[PDB]
Amino acid sequence: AQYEDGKQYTTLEKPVAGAPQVLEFFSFFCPHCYQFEEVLHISDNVKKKLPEGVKMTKYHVNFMGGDLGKDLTQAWAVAMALGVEDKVTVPLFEGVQKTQTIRSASDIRDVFINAGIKGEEYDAAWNSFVVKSLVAQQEKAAADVQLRGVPAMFVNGKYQLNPQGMDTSNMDVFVQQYADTVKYLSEK
Q1: By CB neighbour count within 10 A (0-12 exposed, 13-18 middle, 19+ buried), where does 94 fall?
Q2: Are 153 and 160 in contact, with CB atoms under 8 Å apart?
Q3: Edge to edge, what strands does the sheet with 152-155 contain?
Q4: Which domains, from first to last, does the chain contain?
Q5: How many Å apart are CA 142 and CA 24, to the nearest integer?
Q6: In 35-167, which ranges are E strands?
Q7: Which of 86, 115, 135, 143 has the most CB atoms lying inside 10 A of its own CB?
Q8: Is the CB of residue 39 less than 8 Å from the CB of residue 74?
């Protein structure tokens, strides 16, 4: 066929009941993740081609970057709770990988402040129980698929994208194959 199990995607031997429809995992420490988001714009090109009524979820992971890596998962929880993902994703990626100006939780906080989130609002959210459960959700979702690497994308907790089986010669063409594949998997 044109989309074969084991080729453009793999099937989880152990399906995840109640999983989000489209779920992407990343780390701000993850070099390929920087590409996916900053150069390829994967998240966005996938959204543009998803059928109506399919929502997209993106979670940060703990297994890269040690203590700072966990801080970033909690910061991403804050980002989701305040709905400012589109204002902090670029400066967190660049602060971590480009300028290497993010070295502590306070440096992470500076990025939100610069992005226009007030200190009091960031600190309150940071320390909130809503954020603690949002951190919990991120960890559970990764646990449910026994996640050991990023970037990764899962569709309906049953299918996992396999971009290794795709021509990266043309960036544009790669992104659209990726997006079209998610669309195919979504309609399965």
Answers
A1: middle
A2: yes
A3: 9-11, 159-161, 152-155, 22-26, 56-60
A4: 1-188 (3.40.30.10)
A5: 10
A6: 56-60, 152-155, 159-161
A7: 135
A8: no
Residue 128: what residue type? Answer: S
- Token pair listed for 131: 């954020």
Determine the Cα–Cα distance for residues 14 and 10; give it in Å rounded to an integer.
12
**What DSSP character marks residue 164?**
G
Strands 56-60 and 22-26: parallel
**Alpha carbons 84 and 42: distance in angstroms, whole number:** 19
Q: Are 102 and 88 in contact (CB under 8 A)?
A: no
Q: Give kind and range of the element (H or E) at residue 22.
A: strand 22-26
The answer to whether 48 and 169 are in contact (CB under 8 A) is no
Closest alpha carbon to 174 in 36, 58, 56, 21: 36
The experimental method behind these coordinates is X-ray
DSSP letters along 59-89, please? Answer: EE-SSSSHHHHHHHHHHHHHHHHHT-HHHHH
Q: What angle do CA 162, 150, 113 make, to 5 degrees?
A: 135
The answer to whether the beta carbons of residues 145 and 14 sit under 8 Å apart is no
Query: Which resolution, in Å, applies to this structure?
Result: 2.0
Q: What's the rounded Cα separation, in Å, for the pair 67 and 126? A: 16
CB 51 within 8 A of CB 17: no
**159, β-bridge pairs:** 11, 155
